[PDB]
Design a protein around this ligand. Structure first.
Ligand SMILES: NC(=O)c1ccc[n+]([C@@H]2O[C@H](COP(=O)([O-])OP(=O)(O)OC[C@H]3O[C@@H](n4cnc5c(N)ncnc54)[C@H](OP(=O)(O)O)[C@@H]3O)[C@@H](O)[C@H]2O)c1
Ligand SMILES: CCc1nc(N)nc(N)c1C#CCc1cc(-c2ccncc2)ccc1OC
Length: 164
């Protein structure tokens, strides 16, 4: 495979990413960072994640991953395996694995770059971001997120790159 495989994820201090098929927090500023970074690049989404989003995201190829061979959504592409995704994206520069947990597990052996926002709070949750061995990964970007009236937690943007 030729395209760069980037994970895009926000998690808490215990790796929680979801509660009851939704996001446990509201951070409009973190969401804006996500738009800025992913704009014009394909988003790879697990079926559940996609249905929780509820609509195609503009200016990006939306690719939904499902085992269901009769699944169709207007304005979205459908893939049924890692390889089908790699076929659909064979000419792309960078794709974003956009969640949730099952889809992160799926593409974990292949990930080249990690865009991870870390939120400094312990949420109640049921869905978790998988453990990663960071040997041969270097942090290439870190920045404190905007904490204000509308964004009520402390969080940092991190970006890691796999080496070689
Ligand atoms: N905080 C964040 O950064 C973030 C990001 C994304 C999602 N989330 C949250 O995480 C939760 C969703 O994560 P999740 O793991 O429950 O769901 P998910 O990974 O988004 O979707 C699960 C679905 O993916 C499909 N799938 C899984 N493995 C597959 C495979 N090997 N081949 C083909 N299709 C496969 C299946 O679809 P079918 O049933 O249709 O066969 C499965 O039902 C939600 O709460 C969401 O809001 C958080
Ligand atoms: C915004 C947290 C988030 N942060 C990071 N760093 N990565 C992620 N993968 C997600 C996520 C997610 C899942 C998710 C995304 C959007 C969304 C809407 C419009 N443009 C972009 C995204 C809406 C609802 C939603 O859950 C119902």
């Amino acid at each position: 495979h030729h395209m760069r495989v980037s994970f895009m994820v926000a998690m808490d201090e215990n790796r929680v990413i979801g509660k009851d098929n939704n996001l446990p927090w509201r951070l409009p500023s973190e969401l804006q960072y996500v738009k800025k970074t992913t704009m014009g690049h394909p988003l790879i989404m697990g079926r559940k994640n996609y249905e929780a989003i509820g609509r195609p995201l503009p200016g990006r190829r939306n690719i939904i991953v499902t085992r269901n061979e009769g699944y169709h959504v207007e304005g979205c592409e459908v893939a049924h395996s890692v390889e089908e995704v790699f076929e659909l994206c064979k000419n792309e520069e960078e794709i974003f694995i956009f969640g949730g947990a099952q889809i992160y597990d799926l593409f974990l052996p292949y990930v080249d770059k990690l865009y991870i926002t870390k939120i400094h709070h312990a949420f109640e949750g049921d869905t978790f971001f998988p453990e990663m061995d960071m040997t041969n990964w270097k942090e290439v970007f870190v920045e404190k997120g905007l904490t204000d009236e509308k964004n009520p937690y402390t969080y940092y943007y991190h970006v890691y790159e796999k080496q070689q």
